Amino acid sequence: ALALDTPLPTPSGWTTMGDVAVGDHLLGPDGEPTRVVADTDVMLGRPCYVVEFSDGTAIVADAQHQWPTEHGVRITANLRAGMHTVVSPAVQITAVRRRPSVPVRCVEVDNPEHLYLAGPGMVPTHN
């Protein structure tokens, strides 16, 4: 679900969606370590999007990647400018557009909100 070069913060620093492994730790919605308990393979040919945020960062995600908004969970294909990604100043989605397909990959974490931080802005996103 996220492009492989997406940076993801960890308790030791940074990894990428391309490098993170089951058993590694990401950061949960409160910044605390959260364990990666499952993943996908690298997936090809999926329809991809750029999501641009108000903190000046951007994440490439596939159509079906899930985001926690003020309106509940929304997939990338349903995001619209003006929404925010929240965990309960929430960063705001400034733009969403299609982009040519790149390899993507998803992971699952084990905190009860099923959220991890993504991108250089540490934006909340849903497993």
Residue numbers in the entry: 1 to 88, 101 to 139
Which sentences did the original study use to describe this structure?
To understand the mechanism of disulfide bond formation, a crystal structure of the class 3 DnaBi1 intein was solved to 1.95 Å resolution. Conformation a of Cys118 has 36% occupancy and is the unique orientation for this structure, while conformation b has 64% occupancy and is representative of the Cys118 orientation in the two other molecules in the asymmetric unit. However, both Cys118 conformations are distant from Cys48 (Cys118a, 11.0 Å and Cys118b, 12.1 Å).
DnaB is the replicative helicase in bacteria and an essential component of the replication machinery. The two inteins in the dnaB gene of M. smegmatis (Msm) are different from each other in sequence, insertion site, and splicing mechanism.
